[PDB]
């Protein structure tokens, strides 16, 4: 298998389906990447081809150098397929404190114990190498929503300078350059001209894939879709398009309709722990008393192991009682549901009926 | 398969190994029963033949009548093998409040919400029927340690009256009498003459098995073993002997040396959640920093899935981080370890080398 090869097998409108080949395995697209930071065998059994690791959390605990000493993230976790790592920059903004930003990078205090850390394009790429990830994200500077044109431009411009530094750092490390892939991140908030400048800058540097950054941070679905409408066509058509941090099932479907190939979200796992199960008829909160004697599975069609074996009433009782097993079952079902969604998306594009699937999905999900 | 058949296949001193046949399966003895109130398939994979359910917890949440409406405990949990239920009486003493005791039974307030409940010989047997358990424990009155001769005698005498009421309640319910088994509980604290009176009373009533009650409540191992020395021989030799609430690995080995056939304890699960792993070289606390880079499994010989796949360093990191997956792995290993202990006990009795096993076990476990 090659270091990186993205092939598009079928298209419908702006939607694409195909594969990314990498040394550690094949990724079917459009892809959903569960956030890994359940046993790895269970994550694989649900259908995941690749998982996401959070550089920020991993650099705090157990630490990047420690994971490297212990053989890298794949060996440590027992997941032998591709891993994508984020750059750490977003969680520095959202979770750390005492942050000091500069053109060089950022220094920050851990949210766990106030120890001091730093990230930069060079250090982020280095940490992602120590972890051994297969898809490395360039380190950028996040832009809050809403942002003024001036601040969005300044952050996009710095992010593009940092994208070049990320590229050069990755290329300088032979083991990483030869075995991993590097994605760049488009910025520019909701502003078309800035999105175009960013896309142009990233394509001139050249990356293995292109993320749409800066969305899913408060703008609402209508605005997110409007920005995707003009932003995704700016990116190279022949490389994967990754919408970071999205999202809800309906967000995923609409983003695929607009040309997105890859997704990650904490929602399946966070929802699982807080009683929310995804179903083809919309989310349900299993803690609700209406489920206390409901013998049906979480979802009537889901083929996951939880829905084959246990009732809503059982899971309701476990969750009511605070039992860890309840969170395990909810999480396995939700991740499995997300993978079944992606499989239906891939199949419907391959068969030229994705537009109809999206319409049918929405009618039932929002009934 | 019969309702109940206990066969002894081999003996060494006071130790016995054999089988209990019941409608839902065969129980290998000496047996350890994990407390079920991990997925049932995982509990089975570790080697458990039977699990324990706590009547007190189940009658509070989700409730006995609800479990019956939903098809009984086996169907609700997805465990199709034997289940033993305790009577609820011990947890009323240790966990409930506003308790009002009388010759009829006890009324108490839930520790969860102050709702009012009652148990009695008749109601305890009824609840155990609603749950569908296979081995039903008679309802008795617990005796704290230390207890005066007078109080130990009074509680033993009431417990024997309650044992007759439990027997009659069980026998009156045809479905229960024909398909389940009933165990009586010997009381009498540390007093030989009271233990003998209790044994005589229980044998005169007649039960399918006999528990040694009132131990593992503060007396210390030396005293527990001294009481077992004279108490177990008082019980019918041809029926199973069950030491309730025991215990640590070394307690189990010594109790088998004194004629005990069955055991339950929360320790494997409670220890799993609080960082303690059982090994043939004694317990370890995986949270200790000495394990942060330790690539060995929890135990060098254990054949459980956790020890085949993950390192001490991995589990250390999960537990340090409060991750539910860490508690899952520790619990699976600990229950598996307990089952491997029982298997080594059974094999060594069958081969006439249990005395040597007990000596070898203790030398290494306490090294
Ligand atoms: C059962 C999958 N094995 C593990 O999780 C081992 C430990 C590990 O991979 C990890 C990753 C991030 C933070 C803390 C620990
Ligand atoms: C995965 C095994 N299935 C379950 O646990 C279903 C729910 C159940 O059996 C239970 C028992 C006691 C208290 C609360 C729930
Ligand atoms: Zn499911
Ligand atoms: Zn093990």
UniProtKB/Swiss-Prot annotation, chains A, B:
**One cellular component (GO) term of this entry:** cytosol
Catalytic activity annotated for this protein? 7-aminomethyl-7-carbaguanine + guanosine(34) in tRNA = 7-aminomethyl-7-carbaguanosine(34) in tRNA + guanine
Q: Under the GO molecular function aspect, what terms does this record hold?
A: metal ion binding; tRNA-guanosine(34) queuine transglycosylase activity
Tell me which SUPFAM superfamilies the record gives.
Answer: tRNA-guanine transglycosylase
- Does the record bear Zinc in its keywords? yes
State the pathway, as annotated in the record. tRNA modification; tRNA-queuosine biosynthesis
Q: Which GO terms describe its biological process?
A: queuosine biosynthetic process; tRNA wobble guanine modification; tRNA-guanine transglycosylation
Keyword tRNA processing annotated: yes
From the UniProt entry, list the residue stretches annotated as the region RNA binding: 245-251, 269-273
In this UniProt entry, which cysteines form S-S bonds? Answer: none
Which residues are the active-site ones?
86 (proton acceptor), 264 (nucleophile)
Q: How many cofactor units bind, and how? A: Binds 1 zinc ion per subunit.
> Which UniProt key words apply to this protein?
Glycosyltransferase, Metal-binding, Queuosine biosynthesis, Transferase, tRNA processing, Zinc
What does the record give as cofactor?
Zn(2+)
* Residues that coordinate or bind Zn(2+): 302, 304, 307, 333
Task: Tell me what happens on changing residue 140 to A.
Answer: Abolishes catalytic activity
Q: What is its EC number?
A: 2.4.2.29
Q: Where on this chain does substrate bind?
A: 86-90, 140, 187, 214
According to the record's subunit comment, the protein's assembly and interactions are:
Homodimer. Within each dimer, one monomer is responsible for RNA recognition and catalysis, while the other monomer binds to the replacement base PreQ1.
| Function (record text) | Catalyzes the base-exchange of a guanine (G) residue with the queuine precursor 7-aminomethyl-7-deazaguanine (PreQ1) at position 34 (anticodon wobble position) in tRNAs with GU(N) anticodons (tRNA-Asp, -Asn, -His and -Tyr). Catalysis occurs through a double-displacement mechanism. The nucleophile active site attacks the C1' of nucleotide 34 to detach the guanine base from the RNA, forming a covalent enzyme-RNA intermediate. The proton acceptor active site deprotonates the incoming PreQ1, allowing a nucleophilic attack on the C1' of the ribose to form the product.
Q: Which family does it belong to?
A: Belongs to the queuine tRNA-ribosyltransferase family.
Q: Which protein are we looking at?
A: Queuine tRNA-ribosyltransferase
């Amino acid at each position: 298998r090659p270091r990186f090869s993205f092939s598009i097998a079928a298209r419908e409108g702006k939607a694409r389906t195909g594969t990314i080949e990498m040394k550690r395995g094949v990724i079917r697209t459009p892809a959903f990447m569960p956030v890994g930071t359940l046993k790895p065998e269970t994550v694989r059994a649900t259908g995941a081809d690749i998982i996401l690791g959070n550089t920020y959390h991993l650099m705090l605990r157990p630490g990047a150098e420690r994971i490297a000493k212990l053989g890298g993230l794949h060996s440590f976790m027992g997941w032998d397929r591709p891993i994508l790592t984020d750059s750490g920059g977003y969680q520095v903004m959202s979770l750390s404190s005492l942050t000091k930003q500069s053109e060089e990078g950022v220094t920050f205090k851990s949210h766990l114990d106030g120890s001091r850390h730093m990230l930069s394009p060079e250090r982020s790429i280095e940490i992602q190498h120590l972890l051994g990830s297969d898809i490395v994200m360039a380190f950028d500077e996040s832009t809050p929503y809403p942002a003024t044109p001036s601040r969005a431009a300044s952050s996009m411009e710095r992010s593009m300078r940092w994208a070049k530094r990320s590229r050069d750092a990755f290329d300088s490390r032979k083991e990483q350059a030869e075995n991993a892939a590097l994605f760049g991140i488009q910025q520019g908030s909701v502003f078309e001209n800035l999105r175009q400048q960013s896309a142009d800058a990233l394509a001139e540097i050249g990356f293995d894939g292109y993320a749409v950054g800066g969305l899913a941070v408060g703008e609402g679905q209508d605005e997110m879709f409007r920005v995707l409408d003009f932003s995704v066509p700016m990116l190279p058509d022949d490389k994967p398009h990754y919408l970071m941090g999205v999202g809800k099932p309906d967000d995923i479907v609409g983003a695929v309709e607009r040309g997105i190939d890859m997704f990650d979200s904490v929602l399946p796992t966070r929802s699982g722990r807080n009683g929310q199960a995804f179903t083809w008829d919309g989310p349900i909160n299993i803690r609700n008393a209406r489920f206390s004697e409901d013998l049906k599975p979480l979802d009537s069609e889901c083929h996951c192991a939880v829905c084959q074996k246990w009732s809503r009433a059982c899971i309701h009782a476990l969750i009511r009682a605070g039992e860890i097993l309840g969170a395990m079952l909810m999480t396995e079902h939700n991740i499995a549901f997300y993978q079944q969604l992606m499989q239906k998306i891939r199949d419907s594009i391959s068969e030229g009926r994705f537009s109809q699937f999206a319409q049918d999905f929405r009618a039932r999900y929002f009934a």
